[PDB]
Amino acid sequence: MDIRALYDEKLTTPEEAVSSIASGSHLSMGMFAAEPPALLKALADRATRGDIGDLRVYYFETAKIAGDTILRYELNNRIKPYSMFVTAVERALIRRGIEDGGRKVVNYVPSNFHQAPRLLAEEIGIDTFMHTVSPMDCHGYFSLGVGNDYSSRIARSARRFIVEVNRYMPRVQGEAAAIHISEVDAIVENHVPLIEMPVRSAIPEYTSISHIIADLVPDGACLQMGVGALPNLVCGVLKDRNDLGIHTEVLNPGLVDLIRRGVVTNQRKTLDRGRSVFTFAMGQQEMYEYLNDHPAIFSRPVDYVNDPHIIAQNDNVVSINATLQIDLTGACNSEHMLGHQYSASGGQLDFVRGAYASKGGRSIIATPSTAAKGTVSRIIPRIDGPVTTPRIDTHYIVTEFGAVNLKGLSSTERALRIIELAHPDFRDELTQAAKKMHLI
Amino acid sequence: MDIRALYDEKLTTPEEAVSSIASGSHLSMGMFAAEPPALLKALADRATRGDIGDLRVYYFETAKIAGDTILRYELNNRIKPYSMFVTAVERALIRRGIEDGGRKVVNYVPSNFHQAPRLLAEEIGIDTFMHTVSPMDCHGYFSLGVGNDYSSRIARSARRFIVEVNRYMPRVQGEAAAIHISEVDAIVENHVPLIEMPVRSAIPEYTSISHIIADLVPDGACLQMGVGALPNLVCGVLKDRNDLGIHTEVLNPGLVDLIRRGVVTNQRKTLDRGRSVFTFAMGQQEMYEYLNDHPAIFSRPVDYVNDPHIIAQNDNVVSINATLQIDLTGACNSEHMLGHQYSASGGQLDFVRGAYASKGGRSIIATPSTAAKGTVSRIIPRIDGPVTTPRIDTHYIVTEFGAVNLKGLSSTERALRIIELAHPDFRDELTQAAKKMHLI
């Protein structure tokens, strides 16, 4: 089996590589940084030329890469976004559509991220899959790098798999993370830095928040850190710990810093002992570079990583997630769009459930108590509509004013303890609302 | 070892049995038919005489026995309902309380039923547990009979366990279903028929619904279903099947009929092969008598039965649940009280999740399309507030007009297909609503 010959055989231009994708078919691509820019630019060009139509693209975790190519508003009639998370890119599209005669331009597909591999392969069906990969090694394998998720599965289930080789994509070890040249239909090469998450600055509230959380992290904790600035930054208060583990949905810079520092050994885990487990990674160049050939990091597919039964196997799980609002029932909301709920597709609830089921486990959902320079309360009477984390599932809630374990508390006990986590400026107003709702 | 000597030492009157329960303590009891009428009457009398106070009662599945005695409105100032399900009994109390100067008289404790054993025993803590049991056998064991649920844990974890022996309570085999006299603190005897779930008349829509559902059940299916005329009718249609299995939260007369007919054999199950598994039972005298000493019926605790990971290990699970409303997003609502959501505490979602995870599994949620002589649609634009089954979890929905599998469908595809399950009188209005909501 000659790999070098197979490679040359499949190597081609972005233009020719995407030239065969059928109108009326289903396409998917990797998450975030994995989105292949050369391939997506060439696909967008096809649409611009009017050479493809009715192409449904099903995907999670949008990046400017897709935002600026296939997803551009002008192509919305030809490349139809079947978005499975609604992010800043989709929010902008949706608002533009509303302005343009109330046009629906984003087709949200409700789902559980943890079920994405089966949903895409079996319910939806994907004909073409495209993903950035690390360069082929001397045994004929590419790596999915920062992506496993549903990507490992759809790379195989799709009729055609097209890869974009990028020397900047780290070579990552993981379950089905390695792709043999024989599993690939076409190859293009494009060496450019991976897209980064924005770096964010700490706010004063994070000191209290991080301090409160630290007191809640037991010896040998097995960490998951949710998306957002808060869990990424709170991670740093654990610099002084030892023998921590990682089993997380998203691998972020804060977690990788703990690995770098030797804080994370993974020696107290039941599953994947000795290796930090994640399903996809987002960060900056320093983090991406560090992942390359790292023998103590191991990606796994999302249907493993985000299975609460699997999460719970490891003792002393600590899940730290952020939210946008907490209401007086103890329900939480991470959705930016008022009156909508797309964020429930995320893996937050998987870890809320999984951490609580872990022996010695704790789920923490945290937020500053206010927004807009202290003028807006993030502790509210009642969330408008369907929630992200239901009140029956919430475990620990934290603001800069303290922590409350909600499990086993009555609705009266909950409302009273939650009001005390609000900023003093709002407690009277919240107490009256609770009275009106008959929560107390 | 001398069990008759132990029985005689522990045997007492209901009045004496409940006399040492502390004020300001936590009491729990069995579910439904499990509630002990003589003990509960004696406890209520104790409150009436002003001899106990600040007694919190934590419980699920209320029955007339509880409503008639301890839960009587007039005793609300001494015996505090910390209800974990809100049923007809609590709805009546809540409404009466609002009328009576807007008083809060029921204190809902949000939870997952599947976590009840741990929540009651650990976060909440139970000082006294009371449960009706079958007569002591020659080895010194009583059976919890109709109830396992969280009862088998709390009978052991409560600081005192008081039983009410009733020869009408069947001797049921199960995991931790049998409790030795050495584990019982006091005994009273009260032989009276168990309370029955009322038999309700079928509505016309159930004929079509039971056939659509039955068409979705293959031979070898492993069934879970609720109580009522509809499930009874479904079981009626299923009388022609073979080698069905049972793994259900509640065991009902319909399922027991299939056992009696030899339709249910449990030979195709992966877990508990050969035995019908349930966590509590509700029905009529004929069904209760049938459970007595049945070697092929096996109760198990709710943290096993309602664990989606456990449910999913059996192939071809079919979960059949009812709902009150379905909205155009595919979310379902089972809560009777407008604007509120107490029904999410029930096990419906456990089985929605577990059935989908099962190999060949299907979760079905069914409702007639209208209410009130066809004047009100049960298919609605949008549920008012938090839901029972989230749109991200719904699998199959059914009305008298057919069935839809929602998995993998966009918001537009869902709305369009769901409207076709609504009564013709409402389809135009629902389509308009869908457009306004920007679903389509």
Domain map of chain B by residue range? 1-440
Long-range contacts of B203-210 (CB under 8 A, 24+ apart): B203/B229, B203/B368, B205/B368, B205/B369, B205/B399, B205/B400, B206/B230, B206/B233, B206/B368, B207/B233, B208/B400, B208/B401, B209/B233, B209/B366, B209/B368, B209/B398, B209/B399, B209/B400, B210/B234, B210/B236, B210/B237
SS3 labels along B50-113? CCCCCEEEEECCCCHHHHHCCCCHHHCCCEEEEECCCCHHHHHHHHHHHHCCCCCCCCCCCCCH
CA angle at residue B271 from B232 to B135, to 5 degrees?
65
- Ramachandran assignment for B273, one of left (phi > 0), alpha (psi -120 to 50 degrees), beta (any other): beta
Nearest CA to A106 among B429, B359, B412? B412
Report whether B378 belongs to an annotated binding site: yes
Residue in B115, B124, B410 closest to A109 by CB? B410
| Spatial contact of B18 and B112, defined as CB atoms under 8 Å apart | no
Contact A189, A165 (CB under 8 A): yes
Query: Among all residues of chain B, which has the CA nearest to that of A309?
Result: B309
In chain A the first and final C-alpha atoms are separated, in Å, by: 73
Interchain pair A109, B387: CB under 8 A = no
Tell me if residue B153 falls in helix, strand or coil: helix
Between CA A245 and CA B187 the distance in angstroms is: 50
Catalytic residues of A: 249
Q: How far is A363 from chain B (nearest CA, A)?
A: 15
- Residue B410 to residue A107, Cβ atoms within 8 A: yes
Quick check: A391 and B387 CB within 8 A?
no
Confirm or deny that A250 is annotated as ligand binding. Answer: no
Cα B51 to chain centroid, rounded: 33
Which residues neighbour A207 within 8 Å (Cβ) at sequence distance 6 or greater?
Answer: none
Q: Among residues B60, B181, B192, B188, which one has the least CA distance to residue B113?
A: B60
Interface contact flag, B392 A309, Cβ < 8 Å: no
Interface of B with A (CB under 8 A): 82, 98, 102, 104, 107-112, 115, 119, 122-124, 307-309, 329-331, 344-345, 356, 383, 385-387, 390-393, 406-412, 414, 438, 440
Cα–Cα distance for residue pair B1/B332, rounded to 1 Å: 53
Resolution in angstroms comes to 1.9
Which experimental method was this entry solved with? X-ray
Buried b (16+ CB within 10 A) or exposed e, A317-353: bbbbbbbbbbbbbbbbbbbeeeebbbbbbbbbbbbbb
Q: Was A343 annotated as part of a binding site? A: yes
Q: Cβ–Cβ contacts within 10 Å for residue A435, how many? A: 13
No. of H helices and E strands in chain B? 16, 23
From residue A303, give the alpha-carbon distance in Å to each of A175, A309, A311.
12, 11, 11
Rounded Cα distance between B402 and B418, Å, is 10
How many A-B residue pairs are in contact by the CB < 8 A criterion? 94
Interface contact B108-A410, CB threshold 8 A? yes
Residue appearing with tokens 């109709």: B146
Nearest C-alpha neighbor of A129 from the set A193, A77, A59, A69: A59
Q: B393: which DSSP letter?
A: T
DSSP strands (E only) in B107-169:
128-133, 141-143, 160-165
Is B56 annotated as a binding-site member?
Answer: no
Chain B residues close to A382, C-beta within 8 Å: 385
